[PDB]
């Protein structure tokens, strides 16, 4: 099992909310992603349960990040969607068979499990060391300084006005 | 996100093969772990296809490592069993919806995909930097010098004697 499809979506969602820098209603995010408002709202639940997004009420209400983009790491978003479980799971096969390691000697993790855990720690360190602010800065530098502001304006234009 | 159960088994198999002075039949490895020969054989065929173990014929035939333990990395074993696919797959969601990035502006990978790719590279680099010889050295240090030789002796004892 690799990462679920929700990780790609949730990372893009955090970048687009930073671009808006004002509450974005479910309907406007849903239009941007070409899905229904009710489907978008269901996907947002992973980010709201993790305390990364909240809902603002009122006529120009909608979703906002709960803290600045520099305080949201890629690891925060990945764990919001796919949870905290490591990729490698030790099933304690060293406790099997006629030369089984007795449980009283199985307090410390298997050296194999520890090496796999150290590799996972490098993956998590890389995700923890990168922020939503870094992604926004790279999009700015490569798409131009007008690209994300354009997305932000499109999301919030006309909110609280009836045409 | 999960690595298949075969990774744990294949890493243990590589470690115990270092302790054997002769080819080890799949049947003896299976007996040591009190596990189905057919399950063990599938993990050993994955290691064989990756060029990490080979089958020796004759009366005391069985599996041997194809090269020294110091030349076999955790990455070699993980990819032999779970394949080369990364954790994160970009589905080009930036090409969706009314503000879709046109193909001509999709010459570079998405910055989000590149950040996830950098984390994957950190994971692979950690697995590539640890060898079966490192695992053996750690087992010798923590289980004592007699642990692996005990397993090695058990695996090869009596082969070709018919008691
Ligand atoms: S007993 Fe699970 S990795 Fe060794
Ligand atoms: S389009 Fe796939 S990670 Fe951005």
């Amino acid at each position: 099992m690799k990462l679920s499809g929700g990780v790609e979506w949730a990372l893009h969602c955090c970048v687009v909310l930073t671009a808006a820098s004002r509450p974005v209603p479910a309907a406007r995010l849903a239009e941007l992603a070409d899905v229904s408002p009710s489907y978008l709202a269901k996907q947002m639940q992973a980010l709201s349960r993790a305390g990364l997004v909240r809902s603002v009420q009122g006529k120009t209400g909608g979703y906002v990040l709960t803290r600045p983009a520099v305080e949201i790491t890629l690891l925060d978003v990945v764990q919001a969607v796919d949870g905290p479980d490591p990729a490698f799971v030790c099933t304690e096969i060293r406790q099997r068979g006629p030369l089984a390691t007795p449980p009283e000697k199985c307090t410390k993790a298997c050296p194999i499990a520890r090496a796999m855990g150290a590799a996972e720690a490098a993956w998590r360190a890389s995700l923890a060391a990168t922020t939503i602010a870094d992604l926004v800065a790279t999009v700015d530098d490569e798409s131009g300084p007008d690209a994300l502001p354009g997305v932000g304006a499109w999301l919030i234009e006309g909110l609280g006005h009836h045409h």
Side-chain angles (χ1 to χ4, degrees), chain A residues 1-41 43-103 106-107 109-161 163:
Chain A
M1 185 62 49
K2 306 310 185 180
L3 293 169
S4 83
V7 172
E8 183 179 25
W9 168 78
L11 288 164
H12 274 268
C13 184
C14 289
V15 167
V16 149
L17 289 179
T18 304
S21 186
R22 274 206 76 182
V24 183
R28 286 287 179 90
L29 276 186
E31 193 184 343
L32 186 66
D34 197 15
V35 297
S36 68
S38 49
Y39 183 78
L40 192 281
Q43 301 318 108
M44 293 301 317
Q45 290 195 147
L47 288 175
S48 53
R49 287 172 194 186
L52 294 184
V53 168
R54 70 186 184 81
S55 287
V56 172
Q57 303 189 27
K59 293 174 183 157
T60 55
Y63 297 108
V64 293
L65 295 177
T66 60
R67 59 186 187 262
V70 74
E71 296 180 21
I72 308 175
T73 72
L74 269 50
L75 185 61
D76 292 332
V77 175
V78 168
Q79 295 193 326
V81 176
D82 267 34
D85 292 348
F88 180 84
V89 174
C90 175
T91 67
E92 279 290 342
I93 65 176
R94 64 181 170 168
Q95 299 185 13
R96 290 176 72 115
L99 281 183
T101 306
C106 290
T107 56
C110 177
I112 294 172
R114 287 207 325 264
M116 292 306 293
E120 167 105 27
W123 181 72
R124 291 189 186 208
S126 179
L127 296 178
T130 307
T131 70
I132 301 305
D134 293 325
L135 297 179
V136 169
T138 302
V139 167
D140 279 346
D141 186 272
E142 306 190 347
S143 305
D146 289 344
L148 285 176
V151 172
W154 185 95
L155 283 170
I156 66 166
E157 73 193 353
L159 287 186
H161 295 157
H163 284 292

